[PDB]
Amino acid sequence: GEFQRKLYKELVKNYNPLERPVANDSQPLTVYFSLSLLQIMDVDEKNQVLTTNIWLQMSWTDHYLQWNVSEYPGVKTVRFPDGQIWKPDILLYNSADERFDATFHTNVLVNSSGHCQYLPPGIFKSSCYIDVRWFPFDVQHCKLKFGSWSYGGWSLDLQMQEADISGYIPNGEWDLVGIPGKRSERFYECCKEPYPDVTFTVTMRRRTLYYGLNLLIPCVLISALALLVFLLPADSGEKISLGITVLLSLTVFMLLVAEIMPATSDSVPLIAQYFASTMIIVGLSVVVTVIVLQYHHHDPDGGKMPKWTRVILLNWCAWFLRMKRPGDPDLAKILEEVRYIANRFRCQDESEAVCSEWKFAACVVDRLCLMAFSVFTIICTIGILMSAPNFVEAVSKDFA
Amino acid sequence: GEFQRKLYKELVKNYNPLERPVANDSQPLTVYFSLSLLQIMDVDEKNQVLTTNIWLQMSWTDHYLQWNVSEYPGVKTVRFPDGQIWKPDILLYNSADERFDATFHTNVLVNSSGHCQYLPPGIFKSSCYIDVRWFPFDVQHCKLKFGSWSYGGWSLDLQMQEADISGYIPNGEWDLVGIPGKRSERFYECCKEPYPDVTFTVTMRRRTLYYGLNLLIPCVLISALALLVFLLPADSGEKISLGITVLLSLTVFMLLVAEIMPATSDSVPLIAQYFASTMIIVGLSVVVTVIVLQYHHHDPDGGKMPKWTRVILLNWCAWFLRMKRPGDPDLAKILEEVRYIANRFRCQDESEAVCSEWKFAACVVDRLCLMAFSVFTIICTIGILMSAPNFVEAVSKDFA
Amino acid sequence: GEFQRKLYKELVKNYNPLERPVANDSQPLTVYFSLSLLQIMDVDEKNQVLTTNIWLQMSWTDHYLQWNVSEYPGVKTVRFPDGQIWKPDILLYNSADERFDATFHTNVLVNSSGHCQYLPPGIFKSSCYIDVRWFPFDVQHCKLKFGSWSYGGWSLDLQMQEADISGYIPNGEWDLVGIPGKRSERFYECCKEPYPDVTFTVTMRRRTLYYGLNLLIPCVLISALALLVFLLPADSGEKISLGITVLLSLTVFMLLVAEIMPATSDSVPLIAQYFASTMIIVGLSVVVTVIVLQYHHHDPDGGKMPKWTRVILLNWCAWFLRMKRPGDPDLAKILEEVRYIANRFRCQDESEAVCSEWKFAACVVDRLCLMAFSVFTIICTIGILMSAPNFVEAVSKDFA
Amino acid sequence: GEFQRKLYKELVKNYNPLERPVANDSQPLTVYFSLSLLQIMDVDEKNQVLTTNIWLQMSWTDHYLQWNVSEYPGVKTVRFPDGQIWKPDILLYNSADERFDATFHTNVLVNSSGHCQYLPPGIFKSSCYIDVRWFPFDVQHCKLKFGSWSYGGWSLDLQMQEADISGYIPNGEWDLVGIPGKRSERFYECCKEPYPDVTFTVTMRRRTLYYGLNLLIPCVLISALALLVFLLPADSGEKISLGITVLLSLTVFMLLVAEIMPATSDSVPLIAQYFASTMIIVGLSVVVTVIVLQYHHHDPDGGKMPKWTRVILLNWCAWFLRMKRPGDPDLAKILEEVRYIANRFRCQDESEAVCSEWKFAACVVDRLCLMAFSVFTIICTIGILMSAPNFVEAVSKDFA
Amino acid sequence: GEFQRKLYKELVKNYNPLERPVANDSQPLTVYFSLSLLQIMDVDEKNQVLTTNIWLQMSWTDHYLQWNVSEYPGVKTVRFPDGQIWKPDILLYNSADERFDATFHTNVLVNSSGHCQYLPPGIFKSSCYIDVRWFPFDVQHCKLKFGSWSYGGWSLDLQMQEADISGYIPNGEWDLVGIPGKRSERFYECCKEPYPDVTFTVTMRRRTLYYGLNLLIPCVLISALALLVFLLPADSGEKISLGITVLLSLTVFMLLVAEIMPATSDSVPLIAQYFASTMIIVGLSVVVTVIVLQYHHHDPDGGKMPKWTRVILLNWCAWFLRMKRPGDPDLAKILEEVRYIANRFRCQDESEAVCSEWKFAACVVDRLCLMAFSVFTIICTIGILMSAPNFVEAVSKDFA
Ligand SMILES: *[C@@H]1O[C@H](CO)[C@@H](O[C@@H]2O[C@H](CO)[C@@H](O)[C@H](O)[C@H]2NC(C)=O)[C@H](O)[C@H]1NC(C)=O
Ligand SMILES: CN1CCC[C@H]1c1cccnc1
């Protein structure tokens, strides 16, 4: 329209986009800053990068862009693109993007009274410290620090407004707890003027159903399978294979967890502690299996069972476990031959008796170590899992 | 031509690309918006990003860009590149590309009566929620939401036209069910003016032949092969190897499947339910194999067969399964010697009979558990597969 | 020089880059379009993207860029950068790139009579249908479609010229079969005017030496290795281990091949069919081995061989391949004792005879299944490999 | 305000950004250059790239940009964007990104006296040689070289100021040892005019807790487990399986480590040396157990143990290792038969005596090789670990 | 300063950056071109892309950019940014970057007499054919082709200058043999004017220490370990397991090398030939093991040893190997019973003698095949390794 054309012609005249829109140059310009969070795009623990979708909200007052609505009775607001009016140079300090500024430059809407609104959208990547001490049950706080780059406290006075989460789209992995904000002015070695900034803290809680069903459960099942080796009779040689194959499966689980986790040395993580506990458990199980096999294939002639070992294993542990221990001259020539044969049979009988004793001792040791290892693994797993804070809260909210 | 040059020089006189081309400023401006879908390039499940090829379609009317055809013979249309004339700032809301705008800026075609068309092409990356509850038999709905950014309800009037699928190029993996659209109007915390938008909901179906053949059939086959452990005789010690090796193959299969799936806690997917059930089935088979081996290698004098176990196994299940149960002083000195030898032989025969009885009991248990495990695995697999909706539709459309 | 400066100053006065350079405004402008292929950079089958290196040859005539060489003796041609003169806007329709147009803008060379040449180079990424029905003996046709985005048939007259492959650099994996092209006119739902376009079809053939030597040969070797299970005597205990390890190796081979194929559902790839056939063959071999092991560790008194089974195996099949068959009162008391001993020995002899006959039956089954499985493997492999078209051509051209 | 607008209009009059702002045109312009490190984003050893967060600091004096505060009350500083005033083209020489310049251009702040400050932020990717000789106990020095690209010391004088680490954010992987800088001058064969440049040498240490816990401890554990072959009795046939499976685990660990290391031939990494040592140890263990199995299964009638071997093993080693060493007409034919039976039993007896001798020899060999391997592995591991410089301080810092 | 400002104002008067700065238009313009290589950043064999860091060097003479130093006492040289003066359009013909130009546009330094220098830095990605026939003992030549795009030989005269490698930084993996260059002019389908270009051929050698230590030696070691299957006694049934597991390790090695290696079909790589040979050797070892086990478990009454087999094995090969071959009515009734027992014992004796003969034959075959396979693997490995050219030079440079 003619009124719109005349207004655009008049406003642009004698306008310098390099000048701060203030009637009085000695007074700070008040700028209100906020943001609206739309989506938590990604959390990268290995690279420690948070990717989010955010609309920034900037509001201020321009002294020159004012007109009387009566003279232009059809237009109430105007729009100006980048590079033709003054705009705050607000940037995100802790950016992790190859381009430091990742905001799409849109139009700026102006009142008839000179009120400027700026709503740039963006996919922001920031670098926030990620704590993996209590993973999977960790809670993360990520910082987003915004501030002007070349405007101190005597020129541009930054003000904070509460973040808007009405349009937030729930994520399938993280639960949004809150997004508080705080405004603070700091000092820099460059300059002698304080510089304000606004920091928004995003608090997120990781949902644990996927991890607790894909990592925790198979670990306990496979550890139980390793415990099962204490039930196989020693007469079938399939114990070492069981133990070693279980160890291999644990190693592949460890490589998966290692490829999904950051290489930080800040603290030992809970999953690593669990894997180490299972490592020692299965290794000691294999060692005990070797000891049992050594006892089982004991040569009867090789030696005699120590008195202490006998008095322990065959009586105390047997009673405790309620296991019962199993148990003319030609005529003279024929006579001595059959005597020799009978004596040979007697010797074989004594040898088999000693062998049976050794086998019983091996069985007793096997049963004792089965019970002990079951108790140990149950206690260790329960303690390690429950040591995490808010573990019960996570379990309730996810599974229940 | 001279007429074209004269018209181009005349049209841009006193023009201003910053103003809305309306004869009356109070009245709004009508803009018709639509799109043409060319190809669905990629659907990402881990990152939940949809990549598509789309030609936008914007049409409107410009008041100033009008001329008489008679005064300028030959010329009927003109083309204006970016920055010469006014354009709507139509943006995709739920974008996911590093640059918030993915459209490629082309010319704008204008008729002799002031009618502007704008059809820019683009590779659009959007963020839509992906449901993996019924994977791989799932149907996905991905929403693309376009709208003006800085133009309100009384300035720009958005009208929806039907989408174009005439130029669609079919995708091997995905089947395009449809693409309806809806024009809505929303309020925002920024402002007191309604803002319209147009949302197109691409509804797509996943073709299941590839995933079926390369995921489910080998799983079924090797799960059935794991049942061969009940056909091997216990005399050959090659049962634990069977069980633990098929378990390892299953574990690597689960790892491969997990490496393609999102880490969401919304629900437990069908493929995960299948794999978990088969894991427990194989583990129970291994435990039963251990028990059977324990029965097979029972010590002849290590105990007595319980009456309950005998009456349960030897005569009940064997009858049910139709199993046949298998089966002169020198002279006096030689006399007592041969008596000793014969007595030892008789004792050995009795021990052999007891061992044979125990072995038959083990075989009976093995056969019983074979039948039970086969029934259970077939029932579980059929139930889990049939529980999904439109599974019969997917089968009839893909395999047949 | 002075003439160059004068001509450059004169050629720009009253020149509009927005104006189509034709003497008569109602006549179309003839533009000649052609390709120049330099290298085939990549063929991504998983993402179905073709990356190539091409130069675009565009030629046309400009009315206003004409001069007489007798006035500027030194200069014969001129050069104009982007944005200074009118240029055609030919774009590639099927572009699978973030930016829809990947061409490096270079200078436009102009005659002394107004002939403009434009030769922009570029690495082009396009989306074309890649079919893996005949992998790895497939021939691929990929289309590149070029056309003016906003100029109709009445305005811009597109003409086709034969593509140039003189500077083509041969690729180590794909063999260039050809690259013809064709013009076409199409209508669009936008408008009521035909839009010409030029489509160039690149036809390429894959060289199969690497894929054959790295996939086909090792799988056949492992199949032959798995066929050895029927040569191992049943007295050893490694049959199942051999079979299952072969199965594991081919499972990882299947994973390696599967990570490179697109997830398409159009057909079943040849390599997928061949892998499935090998899987079934090895599984049946394992089942047969289990049957034989059950058939060899048979209890002597646990049953009797059926007459049908005996007349099938012991005589018929054995003769088929010429297998030989493996074949005072004290005196009275000691008398009965030695009779008992001898009778025990006789019963043992009868039992071992029955066991030996059972073992011979097992050996016969092993031999028969060896022959059958070898025949099946040979027939299936030969048929599957020979089913592919141009397989003889590929072998003759890649194994010479 | 009016004063700000008037000053902005006045300053840019007759201003040329191409001109270097010096009052004499024959004396160099002094530029103070400094750096402010914020965070070490990444250290990619495979590609040898260091990614950091940097705040450049450039200060100089502009002769033309001066005014009087009294004539422009309230205005004390001004801001100038790109292309408005002169800037020094200071670049990083060893950049390793697509576009050579990775800085983000911001405003330039000018005081009333003409002092200009410039603090552009950036995420800088640089190429520094990374030493992996003592990985993981390594210390890395990476150099950042900054200098003007076109101006020289006769026109631009560079000066060095100490780097700022006030805002440094600790990394969970690297410890910042320091960042010393140095200003250097380079001369040319043409002219006696110095050319200055600045170099910052970021030296940092790697925290070894994660790498040690995830690599060394599991490998030592499994290497010690590989020694269990010498405790298994030869009757249980699992020694070879145990050893070869530990070899498989070794290969898995070797590939996992190799995927992270660069393919450098400068030296042999410490981790590679240690893995090779463990390879050799386990391989020799396999050879030894093969020898032991060969001795244990010796044919009693297939040979005689030589006197040298007898005195070496049976006597000397057993004494050293305290291994106890185990251990009417009819009557004529009746005599013949019983004598034959007795002699057959005696022959069997001497045979099993020889077999027992061989088995004892195998046991002694096994025990002595167990002791030798046990001491050797400990010595080799301790030596390799201790050979690394600063190992003691590294472990103290990372664990205590 | 005033003189610098005046000179800058005067030089750009009437200057047209679209014209060649030549006094005579007929004569060509001489441009000197060279480059300085700083670092070889990457050599991607799979994609066949060379990424390097270079500085271009262009020198020419400008006719209009001349002035008298006496009039401007302080000014000696000037600087002009992009778009202000004429520059050559030199491009890299075989670029592989997504943007065809990778140079960073810097300032152009201008003499006091018109000489112009231009040194833009760049990270260049180029596509060069990489031959891996002799991998890893390979020497690679990669060509960088530079030339003007729109200027022919009659206008722009390209001249070569020797490249500078003074600032080259050695690479850990690649040894720089050298970079010579050649200038040549060609004809194109454009037009009938020759176009010159400069091609620099970078020749480099790969350092083989890393690959030899990490890929070759482990293959040799485990291949030698696979030969231990010929020393294991047949009683310990763990030969097939050993062979199949070394097979599995070999397959994973082949998987890794397939991962690193490009999929070309020009020739069979040396490492591929080596791995194929090792596959064949271990497979034949497994076949021989199967034959040996078949001979070992021979039914004594199932057949008779052939006279041939006897004369080749039992004595001929034993001589060849110095192998020693191992080693009243009651009275009548009692008599016949005991003689029956004795005859039974005689039968067992002759059966065990036959079995011992078969076992000795198996041992002889085992030793023969051990020696043959050792010779085969040694000669094959030595020949394959030594077949490569410059293998001795590579070994002497990378190990001594
Ligand atoms: C404008 O800013 C600059 C900042 O460098 C001032 O220069 C410095 O002022 C302080 C206080 O006197 C001292 O460090 C030195 O006098 C100056 N440093 C250098 C390197 O010159 C300058 O004084 C300010 N001018 C006005 C009018 O405020
Ligand atoms: C040698 N140049 C580069 C390739 C073609 C040729 C050329 C000729 C004219 C205009 N553009 C390019």
Side-chain angles (χ1 to χ4, degrees), chain B residues 95-113:
Chain B
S95 192
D97 175 284
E98 57 180 1
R99 320 150 306 147
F100 210 68
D101 211 345
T103 174
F104 176 78
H105 294 350
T106 44
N107 294 97
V108 167
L109 188 61
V110 163
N111 214 9
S112 79
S113 78

mmCIF file of all heavy atoms in Angstrom, chain B residues 95-113:
data_model
loop_
_atom_site.group_PDB
_atom_site.id
_atom_site.type_symbol
_atom_site.label_atom_id
_atom_site.label_comp_id
_atom_site.label_asym_id
_atom_site.label_seq_id
_atom_site.Cartn_x
_atom_site.Cartn_y
_atom_site.Cartn_z
ATOM 1 N N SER B 95 12.477 -28.613 11.838
ATOM 2 C CA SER B 95 13.652 -28.936 11.047
ATOM 3 C C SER B 95 14.706 -29.623 11.908
ATOM 4 O O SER B 95 14.672 -29.573 13.140
ATOM 5 C CB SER B 95 14.238 -27.678 10.411
ATOM 6 O OG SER B 95 15.207 -28.009 9.434
ATOM 7 N N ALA B 96 15.655 -30.275 11.236
ATOM 8 C CA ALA B 96 16.742 -30.959 11.916
ATOM 9 C C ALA B 96 18.101 -30.722 11.275
ATOM 10 O O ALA B 96 19.106 -31.213 11.798
ATOM 11 C CB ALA B 96 16.472 -32.469 11.974
ATOM 12 N N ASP B 97 18.165 -29.991 10.167
ATOM 13 C CA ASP B 97 19.429 -29.741 9.494
ATOM 14 C C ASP B 97 20.221 -28.683 10.255
ATOM 15 O O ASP B 97 19.654 -27.840 10.955
ATOM 16 C CB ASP B 97 19.175 -29.304 8.048
ATOM 17 C CG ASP B 97 20.445 -28.910 7.315
ATOM 18 O OD1 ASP B 97 20.974 -27.808 7.566
ATOM 19 O OD2 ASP B 97 20.908 -29.703 6.470
ATOM 20 N N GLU B 98 21.549 -28.744 10.120
ATOM 21 C CA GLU B 98 22.413 -27.798 10.823
ATOM 22 C C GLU B 98 22.076 -26.359 10.454
ATOM 23 O O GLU B 98 22.142 -25.461 11.300
ATOM 24 C CB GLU B 98 23.880 -28.106 10.525
ATOM 25 C CG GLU B 98 24.237 -28.103 9.049
ATOM 26 C CD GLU B 98 25.700 -28.411 8.803
ATOM 27 O OE1 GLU B 98 26.431 -28.647 9.788
ATOM 28 O OE2 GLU B 98 26.120 -28.415 7.627
ATOM 29 N N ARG B 99 21.717 -26.119 9.196
ATOM 30 C CA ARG B 99 21.142 -24.848 8.785
ATOM 31 C C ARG B 99 19.627 -24.977 8.827
ATOM 32 O O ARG B 99 19.063 -25.903 8.236
ATOM 33 C CB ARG B 99 21.609 -24.465 7.380
ATOM 34 C CG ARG B 99 23.068 -24.774 7.109
ATOM 35 C CD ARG B 99 23.306 -25.088 5.641
ATOM 36 N NE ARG B 99 22.429 -26.145 5.155
ATOM 37 C CZ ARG B 99 21.947 -26.210 3.922
ATOM 38 N NH1 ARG B 99 22.235 -25.290 3.017
ATOM 39 N NH2 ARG B 99 21.156 -27.225 3.587
ATOM 40 N N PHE B 100 18.971 -24.055 9.530
ATOM 41 C CA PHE B 100 17.543 -24.213 9.781
ATOM 42 C C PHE B 100 16.715 -24.178 8.504
ATOM 43 O O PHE B 100 15.571 -24.642 8.511
ATOM 44 C CB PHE B 100 17.051 -23.138 10.744
ATOM 45 C CG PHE B 100 15.892 -23.574 11.583
ATOM 46 C CD1 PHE B 100 16.052 -24.555 12.542
ATOM 47 C CD2 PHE B 100 14.639 -23.022 11.398
ATOM 48 C CE1 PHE B 100 14.988 -24.968 13.312
ATOM 49 C CE2 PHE B 100 13.570 -23.432 12.165
ATOM 50 C CZ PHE B 100 13.745 -24.405 13.124
ATOM 51 N N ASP B 101 17.258 -23.646 7.416
ATOM 52 C CA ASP B 101 16.566 -23.611 6.135
ATOM 53 C C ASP B 101 17.337 -24.448 5.125
ATOM 54 O O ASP B 101 18.553 -24.288 4.979
ATOM 55 C CB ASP B 101 16.417 -22.179 5.625
ATOM 56 C CG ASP B 101 15.168 -21.992 4.799
ATOM 57 O OD1 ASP B 101 14.579 -23.014 4.392
ATOM 58 O OD2 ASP B 101 14.781 -20.833 4.547
ATOM 59 N N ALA B 102 16.627 -25.331 4.429
ATOM 60 C CA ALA B 102 17.237 -26.222 3.454
ATOM 61 C C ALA B 102 16.802 -25.935 2.026
ATOM 62 O O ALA B 102 17.318 -26.569 1.099
ATOM 63 C CB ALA B 102 16.924 -27.680 3.802
ATOM 64 N N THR B 103 15.873 -25.006 1.819
ATOM 65 C CA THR B 103 15.390 -24.727 0.476
ATOM 66 C C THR B 103 16.472 -24.049 -0.357
ATOM 67 O O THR B 103 17.324 -23.322 0.158
ATOM 68 C CB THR B 103 14.144 -23.844 0.523
ATOM 69 O OG1 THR B 103 13.779 -23.468 -0.809
ATOM 70 C CG2 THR B 103 14.416 -22.587 1.320
ATOM 71 N N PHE B 104 16.434 -24.306 -1.659
ATOM 72 C CA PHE B 104 17.343 -23.690 -2.614
ATOM 73 C C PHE B 104 16.600 -22.562 -3.317
ATOM 74 O O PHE B 104 15.554 -22.793 -3.931
ATOM 75 C CB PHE B 104 17.851 -24.722 -3.621
ATOM 76 C CG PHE B 104 18.720 -24.147 -4.698
ATOM 77 C CD1 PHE B 104 20.045 -23.840 -4.448
ATOM 78 C CD2 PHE B 104 18.217 -23.922 -5.966
ATOM 79 C CE1 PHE B 104 20.847 -23.315 -5.439
ATOM 80 C CE2 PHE B 104 19.014 -23.397 -6.959
ATOM 81 C CZ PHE B 104 20.330 -23.094 -6.695
ATOM 82 N N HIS B 105 17.138 -21.350 -3.229
ATOM 83 C CA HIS B 105 16.443 -20.171 -3.727
ATOM 84 C C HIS B 105 16.530 -20.116 -5.247
ATOM 85 O O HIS B 105 17.628 -20.101 -5.813
ATOM 86 C CB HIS B 105 17.033 -18.910 -3.102
ATOM 87 C CG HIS B 105 16.806 -18.809 -1.628
ATOM 88 N ND1 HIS B 105 15.963 -19.659 -0.946
ATOM 89 C CD2 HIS B 105 17.319 -17.967 -0.701
ATOM 90 C CE1 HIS B 105 15.960 -19.340 0.335
ATOM 91 N NE2 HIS B 105 16.775 -18.316 0.510
ATOM 92 N N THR B 106 15.376 -20.079 -5.901
ATOM 93 C CA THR B 106 15.276 -20.011 -7.350
ATOM 94 C C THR B 106 14.547 -18.727 -7.746
ATOM 95 O O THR B 106 14.252 -17.871 -6.909
ATOM 96 C CB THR B 106 14.566 -21.247 -7.902
ATOM 97 O OG1 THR B 106 13.424 -21.543 -7.091
ATOM 98 C CG2 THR B 106 15.501 -22.441 -7.896
ATOM 99 N N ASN B 107 14.256 -18.601 -9.036
ATOM 100 C CA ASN B 107 13.562 -17.429 -9.538
ATOM 101 C C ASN B 107 12.085 -17.478 -9.160
ATOM 102 O O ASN B 107 11.547 -18.509 -8.752
ATOM 103 C CB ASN B 107 13.715 -17.322 -11.053
ATOM 104 C CG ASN B 107 15.143 -17.068 -11.477
ATOM 105 O OD1 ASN B 107 15.869 -17.995 -11.831
ATOM 106 N ND2 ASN B 107 15.555 -15.809 -11.446
ATOM 107 N N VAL B 108 11.427 -16.332 -9.302
ATOM 108 C CA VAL B 108 9.995 -16.196 -9.070
ATOM 109 C C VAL B 108 9.360 -15.775 -10.385
ATOM 110 O O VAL B 108 9.777 -14.776 -10.984
ATOM 111 C CB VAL B 108 9.686 -15.181 -7.960
ATOM 112 C CG1 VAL B 108 8.209 -14.838 -7.957
ATOM 113 C CG2 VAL B 108 10.111 -15.727 -6.613
ATOM 114 N N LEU B 109 8.368 -16.538 -10.831
ATOM 115 C CA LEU B 109 7.703 -16.300 -12.104
ATOM 116 C C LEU B 109 6.454 -15.459 -11.884
ATOM 117 O O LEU B 109 5.636 -15.770 -11.013
ATOM 118 C CB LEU B 109 7.339 -17.628 -12.768
ATOM 119 C CG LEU B 109 6.793 -17.572 -14.194
ATOM 120 C CD1 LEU B 109 7.814 -16.962 -15.131
ATOM 121 C CD2 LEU B 109 6.403 -18.962 -14.659
ATOM 122 N N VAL B 110 6.308 -14.401 -12.676
ATOM 123 C CA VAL B 110 5.229 -13.436 -12.514
ATOM 124 C C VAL B 110 4.511 -13.283 -13.847
ATOM 125 O O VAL B 110 5.153 -13.053 -14.879
ATOM 126 C CB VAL B 110 5.761 -12.076 -12.022
ATOM 127 C CG1 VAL B 110 4.739 -10.984 -12.253
ATOM 128 C CG2 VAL B 110 6.142 -12.160 -10.558
ATOM 129 N N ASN B 111 3.185 -13.409 -13.822
ATOM 130 C CA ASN B 111 2.369 -13.256 -15.015
ATOM 131 C C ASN B 111 2.097 -11.778 -15.284
ATOM 132 O O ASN B 111 2.528 -10.892 -14.545
ATOM 133 C CB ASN B 111 1.059 -14.030 -14.875
ATOM 134 C CG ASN B 111 0.586 -14.596 -16.196
ATOM 135 O OD1 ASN B 111 1.318 -14.551 -17.183
ATOM 136 N ND2 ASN B 111 -0.634 -15.126 -16.234
ATOM 137 N N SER B 112 1.360 -11.507 -16.360
ATOM 138 C CA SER B 112 1.091 -10.132 -16.757
ATOM 139 C C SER B 112 0.011 -9.468 -15.915
ATOM 140 O O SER B 112 -0.181 -8.254 -16.034
ATOM 141 C CB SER B 112 0.689 -10.081 -18.231
ATOM 142 O OG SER B 112 -0.665 -10.455 -18.401
ATOM 143 N N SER B 113 -0.694 -10.224 -15.076
ATOM 144 C CA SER B 113 -1.727 -9.676 -14.207
ATOM 145 C C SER B 113 -1.307 -9.740 -12.744
ATOM 146 O O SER B 113 -2.149 -9.716 -11.845
ATOM 147 C CB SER B 113 -3.053 -10.405 -14.417
ATOM 148 O OG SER B 113 -3.051 -11.655 -13.751
#
